[PDB]
Design an enzyme around this catalytic site. Structure first.
Site, mmCIF file in Angstrom:
data_model
loop_
_atom_site.group_PDB
_atom_site.id
_atom_site.type_symbol
_atom_site.label_atom_id
_atom_site.label_comp_id
_atom_site.label_asym_id
_atom_site.label_seq_id
_atom_site.Cartn_x
_atom_site.Cartn_y
_atom_site.Cartn_z
ATOM 1 N N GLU A 88 -8.290 9.919 3.183
ATOM 2 C CA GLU A 88 -8.336 8.860 4.220
ATOM 3 C C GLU A 88 -8.549 9.489 5.588
ATOM 4 O OE1 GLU A 88 -5.149 6.057 4.468
ATOM 5 O OE2 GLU A 88 -5.806 5.289 6.324
ATOM 6 N N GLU A 104 0.884 -1.177 0.000
ATOM 7 C CA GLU A 104 0.000 0.000 0.000
ATOM 8 C C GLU A 104 0.922 1.227 0.000
ATOM 9 O OE1 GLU A 104 -1.750 1.457 3.634
ATOM 10 O OE2 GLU A 104 -3.795 0.960 2.961
HETATM 11 C C1 LIG Z 1 -4.346 1.420 4.101
HETATM 12 O O1 LIG Z 1 -5.636 2.016 3.871
HETATM 13 C C2 LIG Z 1 -6.783 1.378 4.473
HETATM 14 C C3 LIG Z 1 -6.769 -0.138 4.281
HETATM 15 O O2 LIG Z 1 -6.854 -0.426 2.877
HETATM 16 C C4 LIG Z 1 -8.095 -1.032 2.507
HETATM 17 O O3 LIG Z 1 -8.023 -2.373 2.715
HETATM 18 C C5 LIG Z 1 -9.185 -3.107 2.355
HETATM 19 C C6 LIG Z 1 -9.418 -2.962 0.843
HETATM 20 O O4 LIG Z 1 -10.590 -3.650 0.435
HETATM 21 C C7 LIG Z 1 -9.545 -1.476 0.498
HETATM 22 O O5 LIG Z 1 -9.612 -1.274 -0.903
HETATM 23 C C8 LIG Z 1 -8.360 -0.693 1.054
HETATM 24 O O6 LIG Z 1 -8.655 0.682 0.928
HETATM 25 C C9 LIG Z 1 -5.457 -0.730 4.813
HETATM 26 O O7 LIG Z 1 -5.672 -1.604 5.942
HETATM 27 C C10 LIG Z 1 -4.441 0.342 5.203
HETATM 28 F F1 LIG Z 1 -3.207 -0.237 5.413
#
Ligand SMILES: *[C@H]1OC[C@@H](O[C@@H]2OC[C@@H](O)[C@H](O)[C@H]2O)[C@H](O)[C@H]1F
Length: 185
Positions: free
Chosen positions: A172, A78
């Site tokens: 976010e 990420e």
């Molecule tokens: C970074 O941002 C939030 C989260 O990312 C999500 O994880 C689940 C997925 O389905 C989504 O598309 C993402 O946005 C992650 O835990 C964090 F590290």
């Protein structure tokens, strides 16, 4: 460019009022949230993309990031280019700095363990960050030349995956409230 992807994830805490607006435009009004990430961008990220945006409203009232946001697989990463935030500047393990698009960014890594990702509810992955050293002004056109970040990250042993998933200009938030309105192209 026309955006082709709508990012709208919440872990379900509080209220995230996410509006998929016209063209590259979106808005978020959030209240007493858990974790969420909302944005517009592209279904398939590229290390060559130049992302443009205009945050007509940047109004966090607590912990929020205004940030390029995306994923790779192979490996699962990420990544962030954080231009502004709310009450708290995000930080991590310091690697160095990169100058890009008029700003100086610190380069950080952090890690999540057993956390949500594009691969499932409980996964482990490294997070790559460029975080502006001070908040970028909002309300005028702004560019993130992502290639500058990709290359700087490489120079610090932060290599992105070969399989690009989505890549968006995001709001976010975590355990906060606020409002944003952003146009992406
Ligand atoms: C970074 O941002 C939030 C989260 O990312 C999500 O994880 C689940 C997925 O389905 C989504 O598309 C993402 O946005 C992650 O835990 C964090 F590290």
């Amino acid at each position: 460019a026309s955006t082709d992807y709508w990012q709208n994830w919440t872990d379900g805490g509080g209220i995230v009022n996410a509006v998929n607006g016209s063209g590259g435009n979106y808005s978020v009004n959030w209240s007493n949230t858990g974790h969420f990430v909302v944005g517009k961008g592209w279904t398939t990220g590229s290390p060559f993309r130049t992302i443009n945006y205009n945050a007509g409203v940047w109004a966090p009232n607590g912990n929020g990031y205004l940030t390029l946001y995306g994923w790779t697989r192979s490996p699962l990463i990420e990544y962030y280019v954080v231009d502004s935030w709310g009450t708290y500047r995000p930080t991590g393990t310091y690697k160095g700095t990169v100058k890009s698009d008029g700003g100086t960014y610190d380069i950080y890594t952090t890690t999540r363990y057993n956390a949500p990702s594009i691969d499932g509810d409980r996964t482990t992955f490294t997070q790559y960050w460029s975080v502006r050293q001070s908040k970028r002004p909002t309300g005028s056109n702004a560019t993130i030349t992502f290639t500058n970040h990709v290359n700087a990250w490489k120079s610090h042993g932060m290599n992105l995956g070969s399989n690009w998933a989505y890549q968006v200009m995001a709001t976010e938030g975590y355990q906060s409230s606020g409002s944003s309105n952003v146009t992406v192209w």
